[PDB]
Amino acid sequence: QTSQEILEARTLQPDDLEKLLAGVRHDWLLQRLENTGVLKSNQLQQAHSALLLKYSKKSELWTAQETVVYLGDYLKNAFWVHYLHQEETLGRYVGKEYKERKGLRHHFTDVERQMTAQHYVTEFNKRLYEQKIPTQIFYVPSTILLILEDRTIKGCISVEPYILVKNEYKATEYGLAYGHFSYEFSNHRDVVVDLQGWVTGNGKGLIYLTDPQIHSVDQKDVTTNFGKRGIFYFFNNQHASCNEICHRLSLTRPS
């Protein structure tokens, strides 16, 4: 690409911005930002214009909203952020710069996997509630902020909320039952595991999902995925048996 082709890639024309605000296919977004290059780091202790990008697993569309983000200090590399559309307006949020040389498409694919994991958390938590189990798995995917100057993409930060004897069931039993549930609720195509192992909880009925990994029969995009091997290893080494939650949610053994 020439210098002009990079200038065209980082500049959202009004037609581009109009597609983004209406909702845009995942394939279209990956194509449109693949050859962007590395975006410089954003100035801290400063407010910036941004596009908030949200992916919807139901519609399979990315939708942009204009917002304003303040980037604060480095946390004693993560920095504090506050933006006008943040879910918990009284909460604190943490941003990281995305400057991996493998490309922006890896970051958007990562957030699509997180929405897929979050979709299964939502459905799992509904099943726990319906069966009168007083616990919820807590999980919130990162959000993407595209820092704009005018229509020019200047930066990309990932934002996450700052989150840092209950008995009946242990956190691991909830976590493995969630993985079993994700396998049934996806019609035997996905299994979601935590790479951190359900070590953490809180003073409540919250078990935290920290690092989801989706073993899937499908492959789409360039995400690293253990696929069918991962699913068999899950049902034969991690969830070999089944627990009381599996039974209360009426989960059955597969193969």
Partner 1 sequence: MNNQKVVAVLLQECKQVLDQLLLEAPDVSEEDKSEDQRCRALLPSELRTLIQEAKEMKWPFVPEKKDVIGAGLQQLLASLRASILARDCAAAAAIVFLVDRFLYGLDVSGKLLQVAKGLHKLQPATPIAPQVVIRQARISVNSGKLLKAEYILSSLISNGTWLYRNESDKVLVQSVCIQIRGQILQKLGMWYEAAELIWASIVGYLALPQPDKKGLSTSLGILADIFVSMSKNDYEKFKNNPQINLSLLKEFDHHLLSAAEACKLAAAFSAYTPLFVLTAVNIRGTCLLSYSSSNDCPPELKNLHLCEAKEAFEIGLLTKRDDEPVTGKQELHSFVKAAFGLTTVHRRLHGETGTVHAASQLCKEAMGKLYNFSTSSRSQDREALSQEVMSVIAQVKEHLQVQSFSNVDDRSYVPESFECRLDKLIL
CA 44/CA 74 separation, integer angstroms: 8
54: phi then psi, degrees, rounded to nearest 5: -120, 130
Number of residues that bind partner 1 (CB under 8 A): 37
**Residues 209-233 as b or e (16 or more Cβ within 10 Å = b):** beebbbbbeeeebeeebbeeebbee
191 binds Zn ion (CB under 5 A): no
- Exactly one of 9, 36, 57, 70 binds partner 1 (CB under 8 A); which one? 70
Residue 92: alpha-carbon gap to chain centroid: 18
Only one of the segments 16-24, 39-47, 98-106, 175-183 lies at the binding site for Zn ion (rule: CB under 5 A); that segment is 175-183
Please select the residue that binds Zn ion; options are 19, 113, 119, 180, rule is CB under 5 A. 180
Q: How many residues are given for the chain?
A: 255
| 193 touches Zn ion (CB under 5 A) | no
> Least distance to Zn ion from the beta carbon of 131, Å?
14
Q: Which parts of 214-253 interact with Zn ion (CB under 5 A)?
A: 242, 246, 251
Structure tokens at 180: 């079993």
Window contacting partner 1 (CB under 8 A); options: 106-114, 125-133, 181-189, 246-254: 125-133
Report the interhelical angle of 104-130 vs 171-185 (nearest 10°). 100
Is residue 153 helix, strand or coil? strand
Answer with the entry of Zn ion, partner 1, none that 204 interacts with (C-beta below 5 to 8 A by kind). partner 1
- Decide: is 28 part of the binding site for partner 1 (CB under 8 A): no
Distance (Å, whole) CA 74 – CA 10: 27
Q: Which stretch binds partner 1 (CB under 8 A): 18-26, 94-102, 186-194, 225-233?
A: 18-26
Nearest to 215 by CA among 197, 232, 201: 232
Contact between 131 and 154 (Cβ < 8 Å):
no
Task: By CB under 8 A, tell whether 58 contacts partner 1.
Answer: yes
Q: Is 30 helix (H, G, I), strand (E, B) or coil?
A: helix
The reply to whether 5 sits near partner 1 by the rule CB under 8 A is no
Q: Which is nearer to partner 1, 48 or 180 (CB)?
A: 48
Question: Are 190 and 183 spatial neighbours (Cβ–Cβ below 8 Å)?
Answer: yes
Q: Which is nearer to partner 1, 39 or 81 (CB)?
A: 81
**Interface residue list for Zn ion (CB under 5 A):** 180, 242, 246, 251
**Interface residue list for partner 1 (CB under 8 A):** 14, 18, 21-23, 46-49, 58, 65-70, 72, 80, 82, 84-85, 89-90, 122, 125-126, 129, 132-134, 136, 138, 150-151, 204-206
